[PDB]
Amino acid sequence: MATFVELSTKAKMPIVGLGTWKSPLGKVKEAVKVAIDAGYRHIDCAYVYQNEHEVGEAIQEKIQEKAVKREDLFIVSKLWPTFFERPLVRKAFEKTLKDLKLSYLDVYLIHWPQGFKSGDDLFPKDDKGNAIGGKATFLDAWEAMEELVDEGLVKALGVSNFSHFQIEKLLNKPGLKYKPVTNQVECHPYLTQEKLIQYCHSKGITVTAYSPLGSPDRPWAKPEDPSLLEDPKIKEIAAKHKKTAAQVLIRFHIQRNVIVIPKSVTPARIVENIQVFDFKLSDEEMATILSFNRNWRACNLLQSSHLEDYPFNAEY
Numbered sequence: 001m002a003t004f005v006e007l008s009t010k011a012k013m014p015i016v017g018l019g020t021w022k023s024p025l026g027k028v029k030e031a032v033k034v035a036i037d038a039g040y041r042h043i044d045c046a047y048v049y050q051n052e053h054e055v056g057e058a059i060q061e062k063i064q065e066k067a068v069k070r071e072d073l074f075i076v077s078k079l080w081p082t083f084f085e086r087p088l089v090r091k092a093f094e095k096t097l098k099d100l101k102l103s104y105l106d107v108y109l110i111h112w113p114q115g116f117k118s119g120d121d122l123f124p125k126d127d128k129g130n131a132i133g134g135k136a137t138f139l140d141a142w143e144a145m146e147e148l149v150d151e152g153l154v155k156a157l158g159v160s161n162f163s164h165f166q167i168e169k170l171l172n173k174p175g176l177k178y179k180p181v182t183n184q185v186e187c188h189p190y191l192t193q194e195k196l197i198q199y200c201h202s203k204g205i206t207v208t209a210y211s212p213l214g215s216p217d218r219p220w221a222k223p224e225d226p227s228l229l230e231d232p233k234i235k236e237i238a239a240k241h242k243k244t245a246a247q248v249l250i251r252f253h254i255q256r257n258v259i260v261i262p263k264s265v266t267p268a269r270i271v272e273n274i275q276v277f278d279f280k281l282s283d284e285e286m287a288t289i290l291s292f293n294r295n296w297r298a299c300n301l302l303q304s305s306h307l308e309d310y311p312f313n314a315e316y
């Protein structure tokens, strides 16, 4: 019901998907079922979210119950930066694929460009609190991920939280086999990503907007932080369309041809968040919303700001 953004592979990626970060065990399975019933086909997952097995249970049940076919679903997961060494890329992917109970993934993303030390910890740190970097780089990881496409286990690869310099470094890699089909980055009216979107699109790379509602449930949210859902100017535009602020925040991306993945575990909101194909923001409304840019990020992975490929030191 969601319309599509065409990838460079000619595959069609549904323009609205369901986000699953912070969706707890015991709720995410029902959230995915409700989403599929409401017409969602794209689900955004990750190893680090530690809930992929319940997403997998939901998908498996909906398929068997004949509510949906696998070919019509678009499932994305991500390789966490502690798994950049070749044997670990395969191990991590295999765990993700097993948890999701799938025979293939539609897109597999590098979750962050900066590599972390391999071992048992997901966030390895020294005795100061800083993140310990890894031995392998995202270029090393990419080479192992390409093997997954060669073998038919993943349809396409992509990146997440990459700056244009990092995409350039990937596109320029000697022996490159597969180009990224998307860059999944934070995007919303307070972080409009104009230059990065322009860059990605110029290279035939789509953009997937994460935290489009401003991630109000992020653990580190502070009272004084900007709040998109409460922005009276967003609400003003919404009320005009008899829509919610959330629906305007989602529709904003659709009209820039940017894929968007709002997260909810509340059935009414899951349904609400995909009722976004029955109205249209005017050119004036789009320009007003675009003017709200504050260069504000909900997600910074601050503790990894000192690593070589920390992505947010670049302008874009």
Ligand SMILES: NC(=O)c1ccc[n+]([C@@H]2O[C@H](COP(=O)([O-])OP(=O)(O)OC[C@H]3O[C@@H](n4cnc5c(N)ncnc54)[C@H](OP(=O)(O)O)[C@@H]3O)[C@@H](O)[C@H]2O)c1
Binding pocket: 018, 019, 020, 021, 022, 044, 045, 111, 160, 161, 184, 185, 209, 210, 211, 212, 213, 214, 215, 216, 217, 218, 229, 244, 246, 247, 261, 262, 263, 264, 265, 266, 269, 270, 272, 273, 299
């Ligand atoms: N690649 C990356 O590094 C990265 C980083 C961040 C996020 N992501 C992906 O992007 C997804 C979305 O981002 P996010 O989870 O950070 O935050 P988000 O989608 O911007 O916001 C989620 C929050 O908004 C609430 N909400 C959802 N729909 C609502 C509605 N219609 N009205 C009012 N409140 C609503 C949710 O509450 P309830 O759930 O309680 O309903 C939840 O607290 C993630 O789940 C993840 O899949 C990726």
Ligand SMILES: NC(=O)[C@@H]1C[C@]2(NC(=O)NC2=O)c2cc(F)ccc2O1
Binding pocket: 021, 048, 049, 298, 299, 300, 301, 302
């Ligand atoms: N601090 C950050 O920017 C990231 C954001 C992030 N959410 C996300 O979907 N991808 C992320 O890497 C995240 C997810 C986690 F499971 C744990 C921490 C965490 O922090």
Ligand SMILES: [Cl-]
Binding pocket: 046, 047, 048, 049, 078, 079, 080, 111
């Ligand atoms: Cl991950």
